[PDB]
Amino acid sequence: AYPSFEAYSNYKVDRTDLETFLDKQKEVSLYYLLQNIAYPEGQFNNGVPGTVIASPSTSNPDYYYQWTRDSAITFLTVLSELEDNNFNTTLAKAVEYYINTSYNLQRTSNPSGSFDDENHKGLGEPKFNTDGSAYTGAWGRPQNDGPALRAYAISRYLNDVNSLNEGKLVLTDSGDINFSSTEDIYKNIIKPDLEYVIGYWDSTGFDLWEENQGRHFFTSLVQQKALAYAVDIAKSFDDGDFANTLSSTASTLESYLSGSDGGFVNTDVNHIVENPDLLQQNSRQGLDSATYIGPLLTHDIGESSSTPFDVDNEYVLQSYYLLLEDNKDRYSVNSAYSAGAAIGRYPEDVYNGDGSSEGNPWFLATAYAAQVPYKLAYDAKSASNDITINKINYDFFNKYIVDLSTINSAYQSSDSVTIKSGSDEFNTVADNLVTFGDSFLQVILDHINDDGSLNEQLNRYTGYSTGAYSLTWSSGALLEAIRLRNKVKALA
């Protein structure tokens, strides 16, 4: 049940037309995303401002908590909206309430630890109650992605304040707020999260799905990004020694991500192994949608991203392809989809949305799966960069995008194919990438609730929605897919 949910009034998804559906969901999914964020001007005006609930579901399942990860990812979407809409002050205030609530959560002792522990050990805590109190029950803690994603989101807000709002914060004269300046936000909210990452990146915690302990590609990747992105922020506040610490730690994490100890790049199976300890345990073979979700989160389409493992990485793209192929066989709902399809978390998943039996595809994974080819196309066309296809990825391109033999008939004798910007085949590949991305959004159109809200899951047999209702992360993932689709389609 989800008693505080308020449907977008008198809307029923029109199943017949993707273009109009996406245009409407640009608004409807934003309505549903914002509904789960507490701010005085929002529908959620009775919560502590800055609280993001994962879902209005309070039972079957109970997702009525604030997760550090989900809140940060939600705010990455709010920031995109802010950036695309003239630094809208309602959204900016919502961000500053989130920053303030984050300050308070950081200083809340919890079962992972406290702020006064070494490198703020308490910041690894996955979730809190919506009133701001610690969640004291057993849980898969810590999760070391949260502080990284939060540091990155709040760092991005500071950059936006400087570039789009002449360095001006919007809640500086409010009573409830624990900063008076951008420097205060850096020193007291961003920096502690960065210190946590510095202190704990090379330690054991749970993954983003809250289920397994050990090495995780997604976690290490978002940590590397937070460190790298903060270098220039630290420099701007005369924190130069720390900035150089961030830069060196970021480089070291990049080496870790690519090396043997990390275990993520696997040349026996030629894809990322998301959780290498589970490969060792022979409980999972390494395919996970987190492998491509991370890259999408850490390479924003307005940024210059100089961080590793974008979606063009051959191992990431092969994990994507192989999960797609797995899921097209695994889920009967996919039996008639010839291109994109409903995608889950990992092939071994047994979580059914409210218990354990067999796993389902997820709306967020399916929306991020649209983004992968949109971003390949966008990155190439927007920068006039060549599309280089490694031999590892030939099967993927041949099956879904273009027949490589029509570009270079001898491609099988080469380690790669390089498709030159401006050529007919480049334009065809970019167009076909976008059409392929669209096919994943068509899956969402086929199976979304009539009211335009996105659950966590869709049933593997029928595609009917199931699990947590109007999941904020689902809403964000679709909104970011639409934003990217529109950006790539708008290029001449």
Which structural category do the helix and sheet elements fall into?
Answer: mainly alpha
CATH class: Mainly Alpha
User: What percentage of amino acids are in beta strands?
Assistant: under 5%
**Helix share, percent:** 40-55%
Distance between the termini: 47 Å
| Rg calc | 21 Å
Overall domain count: 1
Order of helices and strands: HEHHEHHEEHHEEHHHHEHEHEEH
Q: If strands are numbered along the chain, what order do they take across the biggest sheet?
A: 1-2
Pfam family, one: Glyco_hydro_15
Catalytic activity: Hydrolysis of terminal (1->4)-linked alpha-D-glucose residues successively from non-reducing ends of the chains with release of beta-D-glucose
InterPro entries: 6-hairpin_glycosidase_sf (IPR008928), 6hp_glycosidase-like_sf (IPR012341), GH15-like (IPR011613), Glucoamylase (IPR000165), Glucoamylase_active_site (IPR046966)
EC number: 3.2.1.3
Describe this structure in words.
With about 500 residues, the chain is mainly α. It has one domain (about 1-490): Alpha/alpha barrel (Glycosyltransferase). The protein is about 45% helix and about 5% strand. It has helices spanning about 20-35, 70-85, 90-105, 145-165, 180-200, 215-235, 240-260, 275-280, 290-300, 315-330, 365-385, 395-400, 425-445, 470-490; strands spanning about 65, 125-130, 205, 215, 265, 270, 385-390, 415-420, 455-460, 465. The chain has a two-stranded antiparallel sheet. A two-stranded antiparallel sheet has the order 3-4. The protein has a two-stranded antiparallel ribbon with strand order 5-6. Strand 9 (about 455-460) and strand 10 form a beta hairpin. Helix 2 (about 70-85) packs antiparallel against helix 3. It is globular, with a radius of gyration of 21 Å. The PDB classes it as hydrolase. Keywords: (alpha-alpha)6 barrel, tris, hydrolase. It forms a monomeric assembly.
